[PDB]
RNA sequence: GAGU
DNA sequence: TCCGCGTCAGACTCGTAGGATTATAGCATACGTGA
DNA sequence: CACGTATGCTATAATGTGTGCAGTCTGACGCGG
């Protein structure tokens, strides 16, 4: 029953007969009258076994009294009926048949192995034409197709000494006679003469096929079927419905087809039929076999009366409905329930309300066993009837069993592991599950009718798995980011906000209280408001340098409310944390602080307390929503009438034919966009600080206690954006096009929209909602791919003993520090003794987990950058070490060995995308774009420091930059980067490089809706390849007549001017070119498509003038829909459409020759003196200027980088950090926290494989691709033995191909592409020894990770020692 | 032990091994009827095993010791 | 290039020459007398007739190609049993064999559960009767309305219309949503689930334990008869094979074991409690 | 979709050229569809069904 | 909980006997998978230990 | 059709 | 080497209802098992 | 023998399919000319 590994190989005719326990010779299923199996039919009991246990058909031998007996009368063995799902049969085919999977499933396999095109084989198979098997006369060569009339010619002339045949017989004979050995050596010899790239691929392909064929012990004959296996009856059942009807599997219709045509062929052969008829029957037989194996593959799938194509064998393995996806990696499960969920605010964090009726049924066997131990139930039938009657004593027993027994709650969809949590159940009368509020966040559960699923862990092991790993109290922190996922929301935040926040005097200002208990006493007595500003004596407890906690006592100036909340606060936390007015953002930091100082128990109790008090005071507060809470600013109608006269001015300027339609569109949209901000700001000043109505002496100003403001400000619910629509102006809506409507919604929701404003709202709304339903599937597919590629990766070792790691640096995207070095590096092993600036004393050690204390020290020392141990640089083979990974973010300490990290990583990366696809879309309505980045303003005074910039002074007297990627740093006094910006091309700098600037001053200024082409030289403009009609167009106006030129691209361009590049050439007064200073490049700026030009031919220019203005339409909502495709292209390692060029080797740059403008590059390094040339397109312009010391991987031309090139030139750390940063840019744009180490896991899996270029001491040799783990283990044994070392190159693989590259074919087939995977594995004779998780889940065994790592390593040592 | 398992995890260390050790002990009380060290206070075998590990009475190594002790004394008795 | 099995076959038959009366008789004389060529030429020439007829018997049970092969087999029997000396033409004679062979094959293969020709032909006459009845009775005909018309038993008519109930496919999904089909709801009835299996274990172990509490002789006369502890289920007279060798004394001791065991079930709390079971 | 005629065009079918290829479709209530369409080289083609 | 037919009944009896012992085997769907793949004419065998 |  | 045709993928649980259709002549002599 | 199941034979002349639908989905990645 327990086996070690699984092999797939080709089924021999002989092998198929081994499984068969009888030949089916009849289409008969059963007798119409006695529904008993028909003789030698598809359900024959004489072949597949007895229908009833230990009973023959005719009923001569019954029960175990006759054990192995074969009834002489009926011919049925008396055994278990179980065998009818087990025993197979077979069919003897009168003509051989091709196995469609090894014919149509590409690569052709049968064609690839004969080196015969597929078309050619089929023409042979359908009996269109003859194929030569052996022309002894070299006059006719092998595998040469002869038509009907070509066979008649050679037939008389040569005849005899040529054998050519037709149909499956021919190809099978051709396969049989081919000698794999001899042809192998022949092809190897041909490979040596002139191996062109594609010739060498196809030759190496057939070589590996021949080698693999001899190693597999598969024979080519077996590609052709002479014996056809029959699936067991119960696996293709014919069962009677209640209504006297029958229902049967489609396989039975398909088997019947095949048997009828095959037996008819036997008949036609016995009858010596004429050949055309024989042929048609052989075609028919091949059609029916092909239909039976894989229906919709070769042509039209054969249909039932329903129109629908019959489901074939291949279909039952293939796709979602197939065995793997549906019945084997996911299952229907016993001891499972589901119901509506509702709140249980009374519950503690480790509890859930479980309906009595539900729990009575889930724990049925436990109740029966306890009932027999109490002697209440005599037997199981009596126990059953006692529970059916629901007797009073049974409830007391049920109550006894469920105590200390954890149950699993699950919510769909299960995106990360927290989607399942364990609780201790609390029995409740009533049919809905009660959920703890604080874990609503992990489940994404809101009680608008949500339902959840219940699972009972049965075994002692399962119970302890639930209580220790999966209990809600044990799982607080997100595994994705080191952040507490359990955080108060909604009413809880509102209550605490209400209590902490202060008010002017109110009841009992400036009183003095003995303890927070006197404060509570005063409030509930009615002599003090919660917002009274009163001084109280609190004793806070601060932790000292050692374990001992220090207590201190002082007079704090807080309010009554804050004093009462201090009672919930544990001793150990400072009083100052509650002394501010508390919002959601402050309460999360409260919980974090609590967790790091006190630990788990205190945090859990504290969290519960916070929930109780939060609700309680929310309800006391009497907080409500009236229409008077939505306050319109008095100055709306003025702002709007003004903005309306303004838009009228530009409409009038359009009607005059001066301003173009596009300019007016842009300026009307700008007017309204500013009007909207002004109205919103007016509402928010009038609402935020509208309590200008206070007291004590005379009038004072304070925060408004308007309900909706409190809700938004606390972070309980709503935001300023929502309030804009409610009380302010709704704003500009977006069309389904994405384009924005010119006339915005002037009204708000309190005011009420009119028919047109509402109709316009609809578009955006429904686009959002449709995005939720439809896009969630692309995101989920990405989760699935990710999970599949990181499956196997588990913590295997403690310490790999590697010195390797990636040098991380602080992240400063935009301007605000997005990812601090500490935040990026926290809880990461520090590889290599990394000290302080002055290299003369070790600051930090080697293997040392970065703890919060250590990270705090890094900030005091101002560490620039740190080498940190990463998953990618781990040496552990078949997994990673705890050190290279670092902290389990979900635990708050160093990861445990055995934890299945890859799955965690893929879940962590995938979930946000999948969930954000639903968030800003059911809710996604109002369109609020923002991209008016015109000028950069510096805030901290400092010296201007530009990097990778090549500007040039203009006529005006300003530093105009002529570089694409230009960055602007902000050096301080000592000298360290504080702020960083992105200066685009053609930007005007106020000061130059090294110049000092003051705070709040525009350093850089430019136009956002335009990408200028700026010159580097002065003189006149020449038109080259700018023929009117072919490449450009022309349009004039009136009296004077200013014409603009618009450059057409390959879309709007004729076939005449396709190879013509349009460019504005610079010339001097004479008419000759103007050399660009210090280069042999005549000045020529190539204009791209849709480039608008105002200067016509023959116009004088200075350096720094704008030649043309390329439009920059970027009015998108970005959101998520658009980001995930970027992410998917990264993880799939797609080379971009115009990749940048990079230097392959270090040395000295030499420009060479040109093929009509196409740039050759004759590059000559110093030590590697032999030259290296590369062809470059004519129009692609290089950023660097030749004659240069180039490092490996210096950017030559601007463009996106292919991850493959990055790996190939600058190695692993380079490409790992490219993917990490580029992906993280997307998720950071959406405010999603994912640690780099997760993306680094997946990257490692992408870099699994490596291609060997040059032979080792093993049988690797040129061009084999093997796992890097295996070749490094080989290189360990080579170092010890010497011999020929193996030279190799690591290869990057996209997620999909990387998952298919795993040696495990069960894993590969279960993912996707299943037909192809199983043919490749079957032909290679591949054996899966089941190391991976997928594989073990499929066979229903113990996982090789987590709990299972103990048992699985104990098996691995049993395996190692015999 | 019931609500929070953190201190029990801090005794053994590996959550995964804590589960195996507490399951093997709970099986002893469930089937062998092996006597509890801590007062049960009406708790199930699983909880007793976790309390025993928290207080540091049960250990993978200690279980293996008492396994050979009792098995070897039975071998002695047979011969 | 044509890779359609049908178009290729139809092309092949197209290019064989159509026969005249005297050609048919000349070939056929030698064909009956055994001329390999003669039978082949007559068959290959008259394939086109087969296709014309198989095209009229379409959209029913099998597909066109399937029909054409069985039709060919009919034409073969016609060439084997043709009478050249009779003045009657070949085409007329072959028509019978091809229609005949096609109809007979469409009766055995058209149905997943093979219906014998007798049942099928019976049914067909009931059906054509029903068509005439429906054409004068506007509303469809009842089982008794058909039976009344044939003067035949209502059970005969109803049993035959029962056999006409056509199969449903297990794999055909329900509810327009290609989600769950019959397989996905149809439960294993033959193999019952673990509550029933475990009940039987408890029942069998209960009676085995009851014999240990009953008299040794009573447990060696009651268990071995029913085959509970013995190997073979014996009867009152057959318990004489073991050691009993009695007819009266075996019958008294079987029932004496039952009377003491009935009071063991009245006291434990079953008897009439486990009577409903 | 109402039977009749309809003039359509994928705006940049081949993303490489990005050329707008115009097409016509005659949609009957019963019968074969009749399609007219441009190629990149501006050659008018006809396709049935 | 699912396919293992031996496992489910044995487990049930263990639950009624208090002992929550795990007595697993092979899910019946995998046995089917194998039979389906051999019906395709691909030899898939278990190599034991 | 129910919650994403 | 580039157009063109082919094949392959496209979240997770929950609900509801059961199922449709056609038509195969008519009669005379065999083939097989129980009695 | 009988009851159910099968095999058989017809003699005007007849001699190349269609048939009922599919509705266009899409972005990607290989594979023959
Ligand atoms: Mg909801
Ligand atoms: Zn029998």
UniProtKB/Swiss-Prot annotation, chain A:
Signal peptide: none
InterPro entries: DNA-dir_RpoC_beta_prime (IPR045867), DNA-dir_RpoC_beta_prime_bact (IPR012754), RNA_pol_asu (IPR000722), RNA_pol_N (IPR006592), RNA_pol_Rpb1_1 (IPR007080), RNA_pol_Rpb1_3 (IPR007066), RNA_pol_Rpb1_3_sf (IPR042102), RNA_pol_Rpb1_4 (IPR007083)
Binding sites annotated in the UniProt record for Zn(2+) 1: 56, 58, 71, 74
Record's comment on post-translational modification: Acetylated on several lysine residues in the presence of glucose.
GO biological process: bacterial-type flagellum assembly; bacterial-type flagellum-dependent cell motility; cell motility; cellular response to cell envelope stress; DNA-templated transcription initiation; intracellular iron ion homeostasis; nitrate assimilation; regulation of DNA-templated transcription elongation
Result of changing residue 721 to T: Resistant to antibiotics salinamide A and B
EC numbers on record: 2.7.7.6
SUPFAM superfamilies per UniProt: beta and beta-prime subunits of DNA dependent RNA-polymerase
Residues the record lists as N6-acetyllysine modifications: 969
Entry's cofactor comment: Binds 1 Mg(2+) ion per subunit.
Cofactor(s) for this UniProt protein: Mg(2+); Zn(2+)
This protein's GO CC annotations: cytoplasm; cytosol; cytosolic DNA-directed RNA polymerase complex; membrane; transcription elongation factor complex
Residues at which Zn(2+) 2 binds: 800, 874, 881, 884
Residues involved in Mg(2+) binding: 446, 448, 450
Catalytic reaction equation(s): RNA(n) + a ribonucleoside 5'-triphosphate = RNA(n+1) + diphosphate
One of the record's GO molecular function terms: DNA-directed RNA polymerase activity
UniProt keyword Magnesium, yes or no: yes
Family membership: Belongs to the RNA polymerase beta' chain family.
Protein's name in the database: DNA-directed RNA polymerase subunit beta'
Curated annotation (Swiss-Prot), chain B:
Keyword line: DNA-directed RNA polymerase, Nucleotidyltransferase, Transcription, Transferase
Entry EC number(s): 2.7.7.6
GO cellular component: cytosol; cytosolic DNA-directed RNA polymerase complex; RNA polymerase complex; transcription elongation factor complex
GO biological process terms, semicolon-separated: bacterial-type flagellum assembly; bacterial-type flagellum-dependent cell motility; cell motility; cellular response to cell envelope stress; DNA-templated transcription initiation; intracellular iron ion homeostasis; nitrate assimilation; protein-containing complex assembly
Gene3D superfamilies per UniProt: 3.90.940.10
InterPro entries: DNA-dir_RNA_pol_omega, Pol_omega/Rpo6/RPB6, RPB6/omega-like_sf
SUPFAM superfamilies membership: RPB6/omega subunit-like
MF (Gene Ontology): bacterial-type RNA polymerase core enzyme binding; DNA binding; DNA-directed RNA polymerase activity
Superkingdom assignment: Bacteria
Catalyzed reaction equations: RNA(n) + a ribonucleoside 5'-triphosphate = RNA(n+1) + diphosphate
Family to which the UniProt record says this protein belongs: Belongs to the RNA polymerase subunit omega family.
NCBIfam families xrefs: rpoZ (TIGR00690)
Subunit (UniProt): The RNAP catalytic core consists of 2 alpha, 1 beta, 1 beta' and 1 omega subunit. When a sigma factor is associated with the core the holoenzyme is formed, which can initiate transcription. The rRNA transcription and antitermination complex (rrnTAC) consists of RNAP, NusA, NusB, NusE (rpsJ), NusG, SubB, ribosomal protein S4, DNA and precursor rRNA; S4 is more flexible than other subunits.
Listed name of the protein: DNA-directed RNA polymerase subunit omega
Curated annotation (Swiss-Prot), chain C:
Listed GO CC annotations: cytoplasm; cytosolic DNA-directed RNA polymerase complex; sigma factor antagonist complex
Residue ranges, annotated region (Sigma-70 factor domain-4): 210-263
GO molecular function: bacterial-type RNA polymerase core enzyme binding; DNA binding; sigma factor activity
Induction and repression of expression: Subject to complex regulation at multiple levels (transcription, translation, regulation of activity and degradation). Transcription is induced during entry into stationary phase and in response to different stresses. Transcription is repressed by antitoxin MqsA. mRNA stability is regulated by small RNA regulators and various proteins such as Hfq, CsdA, CspC and CspE. Finally, the cellular level of RpoS is regulated by proteolysis via RssB and the ClpXP protease.
Mutagenesis / variant outcome for changing residue 121 to E: Eliminates RpoS proteolysis. Lack of interaction with RssB
Region (Sigma-70 factor domain-3): 122-197
Location of the region described as Sigma-70 factor domain-1 in the Swiss-Prot/TrEMBL record: 4-37
Knockout consequences: Stationary phase cells lose resistance to killing by endoribonuclease MazF.
Family, similarity comment: Belongs to the sigma-70 factor family. RpoS subfamily.
Subunit architecture: Interacts with the RNA polymerase core enzyme and RssB.
Protein name (Swiss-Prot/TrEMBL): RNA polymerase sigma factor RpoS
Organism whose genome encodes this protein: Escherichia coli (strain K12)
Curated annotation (Swiss-Prot), chain E:
Recorded superkingdom: Bacteria
Phylogenetic lineage: Bacteria, Pseudomonadati, Pseudomonadota, Gammaproteobacteria, Enterobacterales
Annotated protein name in UniProt: DNA-directed RNA polymerase subunit beta
Role summary: DNA-dependent RNA polymerase catalyzes the transcription of DNA into RNA using the four ribonucleoside triphosphates as substrates.
Similarity comment: Belongs to the RNA polymerase beta chain family.
Complex and partners: The RNAP catalytic core consists of 2 alpha, 1 beta, 1 beta' and 1 omega subunit. When a sigma factor is associated with the core the holoenzyme is formed, which can initiate transcription.
């Amino acid at each position: 029953e327990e086996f070690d590994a699984i092999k797939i190989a080709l089924a021999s005719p002989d092998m198929i007969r081994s499984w068969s326990f009888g030949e089916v010779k009849k289409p008969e299923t059963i007798n119409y009258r006695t529904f008993k199996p028909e003789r030698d039919g598809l359900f024959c009991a004489r072949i597949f076994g007895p229908v009833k246990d230990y009973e023959c058909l005719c009923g001569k031998y019954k029960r175990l009294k006759h054990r192995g007996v074969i009834c002489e009368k009926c011919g049925v063995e008396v055994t278990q009926t179980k065998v009818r799902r087990e025993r197979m049969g077979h069919i003897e085919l009168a003509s051989p048949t091709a196995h469609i999977w090894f014919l149509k499933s590409l690569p052709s396999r049968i064609g690839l192995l004969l080196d015969m095109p597929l078309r050619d084989i089929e023409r042979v198979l359908y009996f269109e034409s003859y194929v030569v098997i052996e022309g002894g006369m070299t006059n006719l060569e092998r595998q040469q197709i002869l038509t009907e009339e070509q066979y008649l010619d050679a037939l008389e002339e040569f005849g005899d000494e040529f054998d050519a045949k037709m149909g499956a017989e021919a190809i099978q004979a051709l396969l049989k006679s081919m000698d794999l050995e001899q042809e192998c050596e022949q092809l190897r010899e041909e490979l040596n003469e002139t191996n062109s790239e594609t010739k060498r691929k196809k030759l190496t392909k057939r070589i590996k096929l021949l080698e693999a064929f001899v190693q597999s012990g598969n024979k080519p004959e077996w590609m052709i079927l002479t014996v056809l296996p029959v699936l067991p009856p119960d696996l293709r059942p014919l069962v009677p419905l209640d209504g006297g009807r029958f229902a049967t599997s489609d396989l039975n219709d398909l088997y019947r087809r095949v048997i009828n045509r095959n037996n008819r062929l036997k008949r036609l052969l016995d009858l010596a039929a004429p050949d055309i008829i024989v042929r048609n029957e052989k075609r028919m037989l091949q059609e029916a076999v092909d239909a039976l194996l894989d229906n919709g593959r070769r042509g039209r799938a054969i249909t039932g009366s329903n129109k629908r194509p019959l489901k074939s064998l291949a279909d039952m393995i293939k796709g979602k409905q197939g065995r793997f996806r549906q019945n084997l990696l996911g299952k229907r499960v016993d001891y499972s329930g589901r119901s509506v969920i509702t709140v249980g605010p009374y519950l503690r964090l480790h509890q859930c309300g479980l309906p009595k009726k539900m729990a009575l049924e889930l724990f049925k066997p436990f109740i029966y066993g306890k009932l027999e131990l109490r002697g209440l139930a005599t037997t199981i039938k009596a126990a059953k009837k006692m529970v059916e009657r629901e007797e009073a004593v049974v409830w007391d027993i049920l109550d006894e069993v469920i105590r200390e027994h954890p149950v699993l709650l699950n919510r769909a969809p299960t995106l990360h592991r927290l989607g399942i949590q364990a609780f201790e159940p609390v029995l409740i009368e009533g049919k809905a599950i009660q959920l703890h509020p604080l874990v609503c966040a992990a489940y994404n559960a809101d009680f608008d009718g949500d339902q959840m699923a219940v699972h009972v862990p049965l075994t002692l092991e399962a119970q302890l798995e639930a209580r220790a790993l999966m209990m809600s109290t044990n799982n607080i922190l997100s595994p994705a980011n080191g952040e507490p996922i359990i955080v108060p929301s909604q009413d809880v935040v509102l209550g605490l906000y209400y209590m902490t926040r202060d008010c002017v005097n109110a009841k009992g200002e400036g009183m003095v209280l003995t303890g927070p208990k006197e404060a509570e006493r005063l409030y509930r007595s009615g002599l003090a408001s919660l917002h009274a500003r009163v001084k109280v004596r609190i004793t806070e407890y601060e932790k000292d340098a050692n374990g001992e906690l220090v207590a201190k006592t002082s007079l704090k100036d807080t309010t009554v409310g804050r004093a009462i909340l201090w009672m919930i606060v544990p001793k150990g936390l400072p009083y100052s944390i509650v002394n501010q007015a508390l919002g959601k953002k402050a309460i999360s930091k409260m919980l974090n602080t609590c967790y790091r100082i006190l630990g788990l128990k205190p945090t859990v109790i504290f969290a519960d307390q916070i929930m109780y008090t939060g609700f309680a005071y929310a309800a006391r507060s009497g907080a409500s929503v009236g229409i008077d809470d939505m306050v319109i600013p008095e100055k709306k109608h003025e702002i709007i009438s003004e903005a309306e006269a303004e838009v009228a001015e530009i409409q009038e300027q359009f009607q005059s034919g001066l301003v173009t339609a596009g300019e007016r569109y842009n300026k009307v949209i700008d007017i309204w966009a500013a009007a909207n901000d002004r109205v919103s700001k007016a509402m928010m000043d009038n609402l935020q600080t509208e309590t200008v109505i206070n007291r004590d002496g005379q009038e004072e100003k304070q925060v408004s206690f308007n309900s909706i403001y409190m809700m938004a400000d606390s972070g309980a619910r709503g935001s300023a954006a929502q309030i804009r629509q409610l009380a302010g102006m709704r704003g500009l809506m977006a069309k389904p096009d994405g384009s924005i409507i010119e006339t915005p919604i002037t009204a708000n929701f309190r005011e009420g929209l009119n028919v047109l404003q509402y109709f316009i709202s609809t578009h955006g709304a429904r686009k959002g909602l449709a995005d939720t339903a439809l896009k969630t599937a692309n995101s989920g597919y990405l989760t699935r791919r990710l999970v599949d590629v990181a499956q196997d990766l588990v913590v295997t070792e403690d310490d790999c003993g590697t010195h390797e790691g990636i040098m991380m640096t602080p992240v400063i995207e935009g301007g605000d520090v997005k990812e601090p070095l500490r935040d990026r590096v926290l809880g990461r092993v520090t590889a290599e003794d990394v000290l302080k600036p002055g290299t003369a004393d070790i600051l930090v050690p080697r293997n040392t987990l970065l703890h919060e204390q250590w990270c705090d020290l890094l900030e005091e020392n101002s560490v620039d950058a740190v080498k940190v141990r990463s998953v990618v640089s781990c040496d552990t083979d078949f997994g990673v070490c705890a050190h290279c990974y670092g902290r389990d973010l979900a635990r708050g300490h160093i990861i445990n060995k055995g934890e299945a990290i890859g799955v965690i990583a893929a879940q962590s990366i995938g979930e946000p995308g999948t969930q954000l696809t639903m968030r800003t879309f059911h809710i996604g309505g109002a369109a609020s774009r923002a991209a008016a980045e015109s000028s950069i303003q510096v805030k901290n005074k400092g010296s201007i420091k530009l990097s990778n910039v090549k500007s040039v002074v203009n006529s005006s007297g300003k530093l105009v930059i002529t570089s694409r990627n230009t960055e602007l740093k902000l050096i301080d006094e000592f000298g360290r980067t504080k702020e960083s910006y992105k200066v685009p091309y053609g930007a005007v700098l106020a000061k130059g490089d090294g110049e000092q600037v003051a705070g709040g001053e525009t350093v850089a200024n430019w136009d956002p809706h335009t990408m200028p082409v700026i010159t580097e030289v002065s003189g006149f403009v020449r038109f080259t390849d700018m023929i009117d009609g072919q490449t450009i167009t022309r349009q004039t106006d009136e009296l004077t007549g200013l014409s603009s030129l618009v450059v057409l691209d390959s879309a709007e361009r004729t076939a005449g001017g396709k190879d013509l590049r349009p460019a504005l050439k610079i010339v001097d007064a004479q008419g000759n070119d103007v050399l660009i200073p210090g280069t042999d490049m005549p000045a020529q700026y190539f204009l791209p498509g849709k480039a608008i030009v105002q200067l016509e031919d023959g116009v004088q220019i200075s350096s720094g003038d704008t030649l043309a203005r390329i439009p920059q339409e970027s009015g998108g909502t970005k959101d998520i829909t658009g980001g995930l495709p970027r992410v998917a292209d990264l993880f799939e390692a797609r080379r971009p459409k115009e990749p940048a060029i990079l230097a392959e080797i270090s040395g000295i740059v030499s420009f060479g020759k040109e093929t009509k403008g196409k740039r050759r590059l004759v590059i000559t390094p110093v030590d590697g003196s032999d030259p290296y040339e590369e062809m470059i397109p004519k129009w692609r312009q290089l950023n660097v200027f030749e004659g240069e010391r180039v490092e490996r991987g210096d950017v030559i031309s601007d463009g996106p980088e292919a991850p493959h090139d990055i790996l190939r030139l600058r190695g692993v750390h380079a490409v790992t950090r490219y993917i990490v940063n580029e992906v993280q840019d997307v998720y950071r744009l959406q405010g999603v926290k994912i640690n780099d180490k997760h993306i680094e896991v997946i990257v490692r899996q992408m870099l699994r494989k490596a291609t060997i270029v040059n032979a080792g001491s093993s049988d690797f040799l040129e061009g084999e691709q093997v796992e890097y783990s295996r070749v490094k283990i080989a290189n360990r044994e080579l170092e010890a033995n010497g011999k020929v070392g193996a030279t190799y190159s690591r290869d990057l693989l996209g997620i999909t191909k990387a998952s298919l590259a795993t040696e495990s074919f069960i894993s590969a087939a279960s993912f996707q592409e299943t037909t192809r995977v199983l043919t490749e594995a079957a032909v290679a004779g591949k054996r899966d020894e089941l190391r991976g998780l997928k594989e073990n889940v499929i066979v229903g065994r113990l996982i090789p990770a987590g709990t299972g790592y103990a048992y699985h390593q104990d098996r691995m040592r049993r395996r190692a020692a015999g | 032990a019931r609500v929070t398992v953190q201190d029990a995890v801090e005794k053994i260390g590996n959550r995964f091994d804590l589960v195996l050790v507490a399951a093997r002990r709970a099986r002893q009380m469930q089937v062998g009827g092996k006597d509890p060290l801590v007062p049960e206070e009406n708790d199930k075998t699983t909880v007793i095993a976790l309390r025993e590990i928290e207080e540091g009475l049960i250990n993978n190594q200690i279980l293996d010791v008492r396994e050979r002790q009792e098995q070897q004394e039975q071998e002695a008795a047979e011969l | 290039r044509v890779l359609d099995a049908t178009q290729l076959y139809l092309g092949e038959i197209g290019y064989s020459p159509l026969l005249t009366a005297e050609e048919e008789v000349y070939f056929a004389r030698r064909a009956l007398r055994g001329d390999v060529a003669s039978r082949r030429r007559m068959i290959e020439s008259n394939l086109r007739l087969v296709v014309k007829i198989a095209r009229r018997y379409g959209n029913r049970g099998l597909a066109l190609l399937d029909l054409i092969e069985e039709g060919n087999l009919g034409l073969i029997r016609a060439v084997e049993k043709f009478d050249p000396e009779r003045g009657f033409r070949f085409s007329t004679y072959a028509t019978w064999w091809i229609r005949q062979t096609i109809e007979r094959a469409i009766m055995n293969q058209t149905r997943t559960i093979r219906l014998p020709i007798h049942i099928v032909k019976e049914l067909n006459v009931y059906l054509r009767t029903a068509r005439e009845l429906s054409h004068k009775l506007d509303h469809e005909p009842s089982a008794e309305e058909i039976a009344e018309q044939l003067d035949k038993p209502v059970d005969d008519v109803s049993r035959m219309l029962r056999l006409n109930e056509r199969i449903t496919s297990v794999d055909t999904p329900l509810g327009g949503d290609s989600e769950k089909a019959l397989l996905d709801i149809l439960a294993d009835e033959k193999e019952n689930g673990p509550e029933d299996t475990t009940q039987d274990d408890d029942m069998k172990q209960s009676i085995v334990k009851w014999l240990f509490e009953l008299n040794a002789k009573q447990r060696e006369v009651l268990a071995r008869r029913f085959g509970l502890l013995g190997y073979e289920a014996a009867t009152l007279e057959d318990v004489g094979r073991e050691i009993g060798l009695t007819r009266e004394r075996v019958r008294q001791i079987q029932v004496e074991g039952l009377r003491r065991l009935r009071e063991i079930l009245q006291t434990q709390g079953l008897n009439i409690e486990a009577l409903f079971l | 979709r109402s039977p009749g005629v309809f003039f359509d065009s994928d705006k940049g079918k081949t993303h490489s050229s990005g050329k707008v290829l115009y097409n016509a479709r005659i949609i009957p209530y019963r019968g074969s569809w009749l399609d007219f369409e441009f190629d990149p080289k501006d050659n008018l083609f006809v396709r049935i069904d | 909980k699912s396919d293992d037919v031996n496992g489910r009944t044995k487990m049930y009896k263990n639950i009624v006997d208090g002992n929550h012992q795990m007595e697993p085997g092979m899910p019946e769907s995998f046995n089917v998978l194998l039979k389906e793949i051999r019906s395709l004419g691909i030899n898939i065998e278990l190599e034991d230990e």
